[PDB]
Write a protein that binds this DNA or RNA. Structure first.
Length: 279
RNA sequence: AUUAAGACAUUCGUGAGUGAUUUAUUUCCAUGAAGUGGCGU
Protein backbone atom coordinates (compact mmCIF):
# COMPACT_ATOMS: atom_id res chain seq x y z
CA UNK A 1 0.00 0.00 0.00
CA UNK A 2 3.01 2.25 -0.60
CA UNK A 3 4.90 3.86 -3.51
CA UNK A 4 2.29 3.22 -6.18
CA UNK A 5 2.51 4.60 -9.71
CA UNK A 6 0.01 7.10 -11.13
CA UNK A 7 -0.46 7.94 -14.82
CA UNK A 8 -1.37 11.44 -16.01
CA UNK A 9 -3.54 11.73 -19.14
CA UNK A 10 -3.71 15.30 -20.42
CA UNK A 11 -7.07 16.53 -21.70
CA UNK A 12 -5.55 19.67 -23.25
CA UNK A 13 -2.24 21.34 -24.06
CA UNK A 14 0.02 21.58 -21.01
CA UNK A 15 2.49 24.39 -20.29
CA UNK A 16 4.61 24.07 -17.15
CA UNK A 17 7.08 26.93 -17.34
CA UNK A 18 10.79 26.37 -16.75
CA UNK A 19 11.37 29.98 -15.69
CA UNK A 20 14.59 30.31 -17.70
CA UNK A 21 15.24 33.44 -19.75
CA UNK A 22 15.42 32.35 -23.40
CA UNK A 23 16.45 35.18 -25.72
CA UNK A 24 15.51 33.25 -28.87
CA UNK A 25 12.17 32.81 -30.59
CA UNK A 26 10.41 30.83 -27.85
CA UNK A 27 10.44 33.04 -24.76
CA UNK A 28 8.19 30.62 -22.83
CA UNK A 29 9.80 27.17 -22.80
CA UNK A 30 8.23 24.16 -21.08
CA UNK A 31 9.78 22.21 -18.23
CA UNK A 32 12.18 19.43 -19.23
CA UNK A 33 13.81 16.61 -17.30
CA UNK A 34 17.32 17.19 -15.99
CA UNK A 35 18.94 13.96 -17.25
CA UNK A 36 16.85 12.76 -20.21
CA UNK A 37 15.85 16.26 -21.47
CA UNK A 38 12.30 14.96 -21.90
CA UNK A 39 9.34 17.17 -20.95
CA UNK A 40 8.34 16.69 -17.32
CA UNK A 41 6.53 18.15 -14.33
CA UNK A 42 8.42 18.88 -11.13
CA UNK A 43 6.99 17.38 -7.96
CA UNK A 44 6.63 20.92 -6.60
CA UNK A 45 4.11 21.86 -9.29
CA UNK A 46 2.37 18.50 -8.98
CA UNK A 47 2.01 18.95 -5.22
CA UNK A 48 0.78 22.51 -5.69
CA UNK A 49 -1.87 21.49 -8.22
CA UNK A 50 -3.11 18.55 -6.15
CA UNK A 51 -3.19 20.73 -3.02
CA UNK A 52 -5.18 23.34 -4.94
CA UNK A 53 -7.72 20.71 -5.97
CA UNK A 54 -8.04 19.41 -2.39
CA UNK A 55 -7.87 22.80 -0.63
CA UNK A 56 -11.57 22.58 0.29
CA UNK A 57 -10.87 19.64 2.64
CA UNK A 58 -8.70 21.42 5.20
CA UNK A 59 -8.02 18.38 7.40
CA UNK A 60 -7.02 16.15 4.47
CA UNK A 61 -4.63 18.81 3.14
CA UNK A 62 -3.14 19.37 6.59
CA UNK A 63 -2.62 15.65 7.20
CA UNK A 64 -1.30 14.66 3.77
CA UNK A 65 0.24 17.81 2.26
CA UNK A 66 1.53 19.61 5.36
CA UNK A 67 0.76 23.12 6.58
CA UNK A 68 -0.16 26.43 4.98
CA UNK A 69 2.84 28.67 4.20
CA UNK A 70 1.63 31.35 6.64
CA UNK A 71 0.35 29.01 9.35
CA UNK A 72 1.78 29.78 12.78
CA UNK A 73 2.72 26.13 13.36
CA UNK A 74 4.55 24.11 10.71
CA UNK A 75 3.64 20.52 9.84
CA UNK A 76 5.76 18.36 7.50
CA UNK A 77 4.02 16.69 4.60
CA UNK A 78 3.43 12.98 5.05
CA UNK A 79 2.93 12.03 1.38
CA UNK A 80 5.97 12.01 -0.90
CA UNK A 81 5.37 13.29 -4.44
CA UNK A 82 7.72 12.57 -7.33
CA UNK A 83 8.35 14.31 -10.64
CA UNK A 84 6.12 13.32 -13.55
CA UNK A 85 8.19 11.95 -16.43
CA UNK A 86 6.86 11.75 -19.97
CA UNK A 87 5.58 8.32 -21.00
CA UNK A 88 3.74 8.70 -24.33
CA UNK A 89 3.40 11.61 -26.74
CA UNK A 90 1.01 12.03 -29.68
CA UNK A 91 2.58 12.19 -33.13
CA UNK A 92 0.82 13.10 -36.37
CA UNK A 93 -0.05 10.32 -38.80
CA UNK A 94 -1.77 9.88 -42.16
CA UNK A 95 -3.73 6.65 -41.65
CA UNK A 96 -4.90 7.72 -38.18
CA UNK A 97 -5.25 11.21 -36.65
CA UNK A 98 -2.31 10.54 -34.32
CA UNK A 99 -0.13 7.79 -32.87
CA UNK A 100 1.12 7.24 -29.32
CA UNK A 101 4.90 7.61 -29.39
CA UNK A 102 7.25 5.94 -26.91
CA UNK A 103 10.94 5.13 -27.26
CA UNK A 104 12.95 2.09 -26.21
CA UNK A 105 14.95 4.29 -23.84
CA UNK A 106 11.72 5.58 -22.29
CA UNK A 107 10.65 1.97 -21.71
CA UNK A 108 14.06 1.12 -20.22
CA UNK A 109 13.84 4.14 -17.90
CA UNK A 110 10.32 3.15 -16.85
CA UNK A 111 11.39 -0.44 -16.13
CA UNK A 112 14.41 0.75 -14.12
CA UNK A 113 12.31 3.25 -12.16
CA UNK A 114 9.70 0.60 -11.36
CA UNK A 115 12.42 -1.83 -10.27
CA UNK A 116 14.04 0.77 -8.00
CA UNK A 117 10.76 1.97 -6.47
CA UNK A 118 8.87 -1.36 -6.48
CA UNK A 119 5.43 -0.07 -7.39
CA UNK A 120 2.34 -1.86 -6.11
CA UNK A 121 1.77 -3.83 -9.34
CA UNK A 122 5.36 -3.62 -10.53
CA UNK A 123 6.35 -7.28 -10.98
CA UNK A 124 4.10 -8.30 -13.87
CA UNK A 125 4.55 -4.98 -15.66
CA UNK A 126 8.34 -5.20 -15.35
CA UNK A 127 8.38 -8.77 -16.68
CA UNK A 128 6.10 -8.02 -19.64
CA UNK A 129 7.84 -4.74 -20.50
CA UNK A 130 11.22 -6.48 -20.40
CA UNK A 131 9.86 -9.17 -22.73
CA UNK A 132 8.52 -6.51 -25.11
CA UNK A 133 11.80 -4.57 -25.07
CA UNK A 134 13.83 -7.74 -25.65
CA UNK A 135 11.63 -8.66 -28.62
CA UNK A 136 11.95 -5.12 -30.00
CA UNK A 137 15.75 -5.19 -29.69
CA UNK A 138 15.86 -8.64 -31.30
CA UNK A 139 13.79 -7.45 -34.27
CA UNK A 140 15.56 -4.09 -34.66
CA UNK A 141 19.09 -5.58 -34.76
CA UNK A 142 20.60 -2.21 -33.85
CA UNK A 143 18.90 -0.30 -36.67
CA UNK A 144 16.47 2.60 -36.45
CA UNK A 145 12.93 1.30 -36.12
CA UNK A 146 9.32 2.40 -35.85
CA UNK A 147 7.09 -0.50 -34.80
CA UNK A 148 3.29 -0.51 -34.64
CA UNK A 149 1.33 -3.48 -33.35
CA UNK A 150 -2.11 -3.07 -34.89
CA UNK A 151 -1.83 -4.66 -38.37
CA UNK A 152 -4.02 -1.87 -39.76
CA UNK A 153 -1.43 0.77 -38.80
CA UNK A 154 1.32 -0.63 -41.03
CA UNK A 155 2.83 2.10 -43.18
CA UNK A 156 1.61 4.92 -40.95
CA UNK A 157 3.87 7.93 -41.42
CA UNK A 158 5.18 10.06 -38.58
CA UNK A 159 4.89 13.52 -40.07
CA UNK A 160 7.70 15.32 -38.23
CA UNK A 161 10.14 12.42 -38.58
CA UNK A 162 9.15 11.30 -42.07
CA UNK A 163 9.43 7.58 -41.31
CA UNK A 164 6.74 4.99 -42.05
CA UNK A 165 6.00 2.46 -39.33
CA UNK A 166 6.47 -1.28 -39.81
CA UNK A 167 4.50 -4.04 -38.12
CA UNK A 168 6.57 -6.77 -36.39
CA UNK A 169 4.04 -9.59 -36.38
CA UNK A 170 5.77 -11.85 -33.85
CA UNK A 171 6.04 -9.17 -31.13
CA UNK A 172 2.86 -9.24 -28.99
CA UNK A 173 1.49 -6.19 -27.20
CA UNK A 174 -0.62 -7.15 -24.19
CA UNK A 175 -3.92 -5.37 -23.42
CA UNK A 176 -2.63 -4.04 -20.09
CA UNK A 177 0.37 -2.53 -21.89
CA UNK A 178 -2.12 -1.03 -24.36
CA UNK A 179 -4.04 0.52 -21.46
CA UNK A 180 -0.85 1.90 -19.90
CA UNK A 181 1.06 3.20 -22.93
CA UNK A 182 -2.07 4.12 -24.89
CA UNK A 183 -3.93 3.04 -28.01
CA UNK A 184 -2.35 3.24 -31.47
CA UNK A 185 1.13 2.90 -29.99
CA UNK A 186 4.32 3.31 -32.03
CA UNK A 187 7.69 2.39 -30.51
CA UNK A 188 10.58 4.27 -32.12
CA UNK A 189 14.33 4.51 -31.76
CA UNK A 190 15.81 6.97 -29.28
CA UNK A 191 16.85 9.38 -32.04
CA UNK A 192 13.35 9.49 -33.55
CA UNK A 193 11.74 10.25 -30.19
CA UNK A 194 14.42 12.83 -29.36
CA UNK A 195 13.74 14.59 -32.67
CA UNK A 196 9.98 14.39 -32.07
CA UNK A 197 10.21 15.78 -28.53
CA UNK A 198 12.83 18.49 -29.15
CA UNK A 199 12.12 22.22 -29.07
CA UNK A 200 11.90 22.49 -32.87
CA UNK A 201 9.21 19.79 -33.22
CA UNK A 202 7.08 20.38 -30.13
CA UNK A 203 3.96 22.49 -30.80
CA UNK A 204 4.82 26.19 -30.64
CA UNK A 205 1.98 28.72 -30.49
CA UNK A 206 2.09 32.42 -31.35
CA UNK A 207 0.28 34.84 -29.05
CA UNK A 208 -0.16 38.60 -28.83
CA UNK A 209 -1.67 41.29 -26.62
CA UNK A 210 -3.99 43.78 -28.33
CA UNK A 211 -4.66 47.34 -27.14
CA UNK A 212 -7.67 48.79 -29.00
CA UNK A 213 -7.02 46.54 -32.00
CA UNK A 214 -3.29 47.15 -32.45
CA UNK A 215 -0.73 44.62 -31.24
CA UNK A 216 1.07 45.68 -28.06
CA UNK A 217 3.14 42.53 -27.47
CA UNK A 218 4.05 39.28 -29.22
CA UNK A 219 5.63 36.09 -27.90
CA UNK A 220 5.93 32.41 -28.77
CA UNK A 221 4.80 29.66 -26.40
CA UNK A 222 5.59 25.96 -26.62
CA UNK A 223 3.23 23.38 -25.13
CA UNK A 224 2.93 19.68 -24.46
CA UNK A 225 0.50 18.12 -26.97
CA UNK A 226 -2.96 17.16 -25.79
CA UNK A 227 -3.40 13.47 -24.79
CA UNK A 228 0.23 13.24 -23.66
CA UNK A 229 0.81 10.60 -20.98
CA UNK A 230 3.04 11.19 -17.96
CA UNK A 231 3.71 9.00 -14.93
CA UNK A 232 4.76 9.85 -11.38
CA UNK A 233 5.35 7.90 -8.18
CA UNK A 234 3.47 8.62 -4.95
CA UNK A 235 4.86 7.40 -1.61
CA UNK A 236 2.74 7.63 1.53
CA UNK A 237 4.69 7.87 4.77
CA UNK A 238 3.13 7.63 8.24
CA UNK A 239 -0.13 8.94 6.80
CA UNK A 240 -3.53 7.94 8.15
CA UNK A 241 -5.28 5.28 6.09
CA UNK A 242 -8.67 7.03 6.00
CA UNK A 243 -7.28 10.28 4.58
CA UNK A 244 -5.14 8.28 2.15
CA UNK A 245 -8.19 6.35 0.94
CA UNK A 246 -10.16 9.58 0.51
CA UNK A 247 -7.24 11.08 -1.43
CA UNK A 248 -6.86 8.05 -3.70
CA UNK A 249 -10.60 7.79 -4.35
CA UNK A 250 -10.95 11.48 -5.22
CA UNK A 251 -7.75 11.54 -7.30
CA UNK A 252 -8.68 8.45 -9.35
CA UNK A 253 -12.37 9.32 -9.70
CA UNK A 254 -13.27 9.68 -13.41
CA UNK A 255 -15.06 12.98 -12.69
CA UNK A 256 -11.92 14.55 -11.17
CA UNK A 257 -9.97 16.93 -13.42
CA UNK A 258 -6.72 18.46 -12.14
CA UNK A 259 -5.13 21.61 -13.58
CA UNK A 260 -1.33 21.47 -13.75
CA UNK A 261 0.88 24.28 -15.02
CA UNK A 262 0.16 27.72 -16.44
CA UNK A 263 -2.68 29.32 -18.40
CA UNK A 264 -5.51 27.79 -16.37
CA UNK A 265 -8.06 30.33 -17.63
CA UNK A 266 -7.43 29.32 -21.26
CA UNK A 267 -7.74 25.61 -20.52
CA UNK A 268 -4.09 24.55 -20.28
CA UNK A 269 -2.82 21.60 -18.30
CA UNK A 270 -6.10 19.83 -17.53
CA UNK A 271 -5.48 16.15 -16.89
CA UNK A 272 -6.80 12.98 -15.28
CA UNK A 273 -4.82 10.91 -12.77
CA UNK A 274 -5.11 7.13 -13.11
CA UNK A 275 -3.59 4.45 -10.91
CA UNK A 276 -1.51 1.54 -12.15
CA UNK A 277 -4.09 -1.13 -12.96
CA UNK A 278 -3.33 -4.71 -11.87
CA UNK A 279 -2.02 -6.79 -14.76
C1' A B 1 37.71 10.09 28.46
C1' U B 2 40.40 14.47 25.50
C1' U B 3 36.38 22.67 26.84
C1' A B 4 33.39 16.24 25.76
C1' A B 5 28.79 13.31 23.70
C1' G B 6 23.76 13.73 20.73
C1' A B 7 21.74 17.22 16.37
C1' C B 8 20.12 16.22 7.84
C1' A B 9 20.04 23.73 6.83
C1' U B 10 15.31 21.58 7.56
C1' U B 11 9.24 22.62 7.40
C1' C B 12 5.50 24.88 4.57
C1' G B 13 5.54 27.02 -1.10
C1' U B 14 2.16 25.28 -8.79
C1' G B 15 6.70 29.86 -12.72
C1' A B 16 2.01 31.56 -11.69
C1' G B 17 -1.33 35.61 -12.53
C1' U B 18 -3.50 39.44 -17.16
C1' G B 19 -2.78 38.88 -23.01
C1' A B 20 -7.32 37.71 -29.83
C1' U B 21 -1.27 36.63 -34.33
C1' U B 22 -3.71 41.05 -34.73
C1' U B 23 -3.64 45.82 -37.63
C1' A B 24 -3.15 48.16 -42.93
C1' U B 25 -3.69 46.10 -48.32
C1' U B 26 -9.51 46.17 -54.58
C1' U B 27 -7.02 39.61 -57.99
C1' C B 28 -6.18 44.06 -60.24
C1' C B 29 -3.71 46.38 -64.83
C1' A B 30 -3.54 46.26 -70.94
C1' U B 31 -6.55 44.07 -74.82
C1' G B 32 -12.03 45.81 -80.88
C1' A B 33 -15.88 38.92 -81.24
C1' A B 34 -13.28 40.57 -84.85
C1' G B 35 -11.24 39.85 -90.63
C1' U B 36 -12.49 38.74 -95.75
C1' G B 37 -16.20 38.28 -99.70
C1' G B 38 -16.10 34.70 -104.20
C1' C B 39 -18.08 33.09 -109.18
C1' G B 40 -21.43 33.68 -113.10
C1' U B 41 -16.79 39.30 -117.40
Amino acid sequence: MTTRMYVINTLSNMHVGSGEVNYGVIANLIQRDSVTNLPNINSSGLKGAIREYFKENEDLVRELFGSAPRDEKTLPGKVRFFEANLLSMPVRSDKVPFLMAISDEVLQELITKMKFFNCEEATQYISHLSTLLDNIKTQAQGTDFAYVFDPLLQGAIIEEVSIRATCPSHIPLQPSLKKLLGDRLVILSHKYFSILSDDNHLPVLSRNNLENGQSANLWYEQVLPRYSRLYFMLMDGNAQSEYLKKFRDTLCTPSTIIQIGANASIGYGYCQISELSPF
